[PDB]
Design a protein around this nucleic acid. Structure first.
Ligand SMILES: [Mg+2]
Ligand SMILES: [Mg+2]
Ligand SMILES: [Mg+2]
Ligand SMILES: [Mg+2]
Ligand SMILES: [Mg+2]
Ligand SMILES: [Mg+2]
Ligand SMILES: [Mg+2]
Ligand SMILES: [Mg+2]
Ligand SMILES: [Mg+2]
Ligand SMILES: [Zn+2]
Lengths: 86, 135, 99, 220, 97
RNA sequence: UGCCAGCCACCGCGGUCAUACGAUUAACCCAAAUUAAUAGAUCCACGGCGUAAAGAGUGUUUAAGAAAAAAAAUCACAAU
């Protein structure tokens, strides 16, 4: 979201975010299902599926998004461009 | 609220999953109707890539032996005297007559093209159709 | 019951073959001043100009005789991915339904 | 309240419940020219599994599949009308504009045949009003707009979680359409046939609703 | 077991291919008439394809022939030989309007 | 104090309303240690080469490799 004022942009981005929602399947409601590797544009995300006791070892942004999804155990390395949106 | 991503999956996928997560607390009508009688294909998004290299399509061209005859008929006599009615479902043209005559003289065992052709022309002249031909 | 193949094989459009220079019967379903919009029954209507000889004999519902050139007027042009449909057919208006 | 759940649950247990099977046939369709597509140069890539073949440059739509699809499409459309929900007829074609507006008026259904305003489905509350209901099904008699691009309302009904029935010609894109029926949208008998078909499915649905309602009121 | 299904034959209706006026003729440097048909009367220039309307093969052939006949002393370069002025005009150009 | 005096690992700070200099108040964080300087440990490419560093002006053979399943050498036009 984008505005002249910071507050406004915050609001816009919240309310707009509700509209685009994904369902993310969770194996046993903590990890993901299987190992993922993806190259999106110039970014490389590589995510490995952990056992129960191993909490969220990840780029901080990914840890955030994960706490919001409900994924409690993961490992993810990002390489190439770390640009946030991408 | 909803899921405005068109590209993610089918409307059914997104809706069902959104309900499943407890986000959408009211089930729409068209959901149950869909559940009862699903479409043939999942209406998922797909991108129309252009085709490259050697790859072509699988579409078959439509041809029958009757055509192989109609070609000769049109080469000699052109389009028939009766014009065409594409409104009439059961309409048979001059060429179609010629086709059936040729098919019937083929069942008599004549393997020569000239015999079959000229004698189907005579078998048509017998019924009273005029073939003016072309130069 | 009739298989779709069976119907297609014997239909009047299948019998015609190539649509070039074909004598066809068609009907006028619409009119603008000099323009006669003519459904000859294939897919698209064609559009012919009202001749000078017996001009008023051509009305909505009238039947006429055509020489079919093209079923659908279409061509591909420089730098395009697909062809360009004019959404018409190409014909010559000869005379009207001598009967 | 339990018997209202009965009146909603009952029709889903029969395949033919409004008996629409008898409204058309392969021959019926064939005589409406429905099997006829555009030139092969204009073919859309996703349309090939729906093609019986190409006869001398013209694309012939397989009417077996057309019937198989149209069955399900009409089935859905009637079930929607039965459950009391909004049906919108969308086409941007100026020949059949009047015909379609007429058709929808006569089914007691709504029609947008005009220029589609940009935020219409996406931003409803501003364009239409303070709070609104949106069509529970949208029917496309023409999936294209007069510049030959896909009608926006396809992408935006997808976006909105609305199911979509449409007649997808040889050059149209079926992908984002929920119940596509492959067939001819250009020639008048085809458009008229489909207009009529959907009209009848709607009318039958609404009637059966009325009658099963009367039966429900006499039950107690 | 359906006999109404289409047959994978090549196109029977397919027309013959159109032909250069000279398709299977022989262009000879020795005959100045046929050559000077393709020359501009006033200039002596050689007309291109868009004018003469030939297969590439025959446009080439006519050209090479013309050049050869010109240097061997059979045909004049700077004008069409007056004698051949009233021969059939096969070219698509219109000077006088 | 006023682009002075000074500060900084990198961005940078100081021109009269300096949370960046100097001192005071408060706080933070390590702790018998705390900072600075210097060496290490770690760290480059199983990535790339149209526009960013990068396909070497051209062809042939040697060395050295690959052969991993199916075939081929060859005809209008301005090579030398
Ligand atoms: Mg169309
Ligand atoms: Mg200091
Ligand atoms: Mg101060
Ligand atoms: Mg500092
Ligand atoms: Mg200080
Ligand atoms: Mg690097
Ligand atoms: Mg470079
Ligand atoms: Mg080079
Ligand atoms: Mg150099
Ligand atoms: Zn030639």
């Amino acid at each position: 979201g984008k505005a002249t004022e910071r507050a406004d942009a915050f609001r816009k981005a919240k309310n707009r975010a509700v509209h685009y929602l994904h369902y993310i399947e969770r194996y046993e409601d903590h990890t993901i299902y299987h190992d993922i590797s993806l190259k999106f544009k110039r970014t490389h995300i590589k995510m490995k599926k952990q056992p129960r006791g191993y909490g969220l070892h990840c780029h901080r942004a990914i840890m955030t998004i994960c706490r919001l999804i409900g994924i409690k155990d993961l490992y993810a390395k990002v390489s190439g461009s770390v640009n946030m949106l991408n | 609220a909803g899921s405005r991503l068109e590209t993610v999956g089918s409307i059914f996928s997104r809706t069902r999953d959104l309900i499943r997560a407890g986000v959408l607390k009211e089930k729409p009508l068209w959901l149950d109707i869909y559940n009862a009688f699903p479409p043939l294909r999942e209406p998922v998004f797909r991108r129309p890539r252009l085709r490259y290299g050697k790859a072509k399509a699988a579409v078959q061209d439509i041809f029958y032996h009757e055509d192989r005859i109609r070609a000769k008929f049109y080469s000699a006599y052109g389009s028939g005297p009766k014009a065409f009615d594409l409104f009439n479902p059961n309409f048979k043209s001059t060429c179609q007559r010629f086709v059936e005559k040729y098919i019937e003289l083929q069942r008599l065992g004549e393997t020569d093209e000239e015999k079959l052709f000229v004698e189907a022309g005579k078998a048509l002249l017998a019924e009273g159709v005029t073939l003016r031909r072309v130069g | 019951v009739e298989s779709f193949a069976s119907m297609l094989r014997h239909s009047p459009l299948t019998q015609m073959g190539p649509a070039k220079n074909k004598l066809v019967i068609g009907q006028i379903f619409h009119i603008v001043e000099d323009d006669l919009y003519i459904d000859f029954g294939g897919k698209f209507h064609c559009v012919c100009k009202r001749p000078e000889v017996d001009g008023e004999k051509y009305q909505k519902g009238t039947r006429v005789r055509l020489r079919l050139l093209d079923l659908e007027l279409t061509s591909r042009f420089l730098g395009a991915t697909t062809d360009t449909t004019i959404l018409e057919a190409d014909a010559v208006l000869l005379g009207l339904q001598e009967s | 309240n339990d018997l209202r759940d009965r009146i909603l649950s009952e029709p889903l247990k029969h395949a033919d419940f409004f008996n629409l099977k008898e409204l058309f046939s392969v021959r019926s369709l064939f005589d409406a020219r429905v099997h006829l597509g555009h030139k092969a140069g204009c073919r859309h890539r996703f349309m090939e599994p729906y093609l019986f073949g190409s006869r001398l440059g013209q694309d012939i739509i397989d009417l077996e599949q057309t019937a198989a699809h149209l069955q399900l499409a009409l089935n859905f459309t009637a079930h929607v009308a039965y459950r009391e929900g909004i049906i919108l007829f969308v086409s941007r074609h100026r020949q059949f504009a009047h015909l379609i507006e007429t058709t929808a008026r006569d089914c007691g259904e709504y029609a947008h045949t005009r220029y589609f305003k940009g935020g219409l489905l996406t931003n409803a509350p501003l364009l239409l009003g303070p709070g609104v209901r949106l069509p529970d099904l949208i029917i496309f008699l023409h999936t294209l707009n007069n510049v030959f691009e896909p009608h926006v309302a396809v992408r935006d009904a997808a976006k909105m979680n609305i199911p979509t029935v449409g007649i997808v010609d040889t050059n149209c894109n079926p992908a984002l359409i929920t119940y596509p029926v492959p067939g001819n949208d250009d020639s008048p008998p085809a458009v008229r046939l489909f207009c009529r078909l959907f009209q009848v499915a709607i009318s039958r649905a609404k009637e059966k609703r009325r009658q099963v309602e009367a039966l429900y009121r006499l039950q107690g | 077991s359906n006999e109404d299904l289409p047959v994978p034959m090549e196109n029977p209706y397919k027309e013959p291919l159109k032909k250069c006026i000279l398709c299977e003729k022989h262009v000879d440097y020795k005959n100045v008439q046929l050559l000077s048909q393709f020359i501009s009367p006033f200039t002596g220039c050689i007309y291109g394809r868009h004018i003469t309307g030939l297969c590439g093969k025959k446009q080439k052939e006519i050209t090479k022939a013309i050049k050869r006949a010109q240097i061997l002393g059979f045909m004049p370069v700077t004008y069409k030989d007056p004698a051949y002025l009233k021969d059939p005009k096969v070219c698509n150009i219109k000077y006088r309007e």
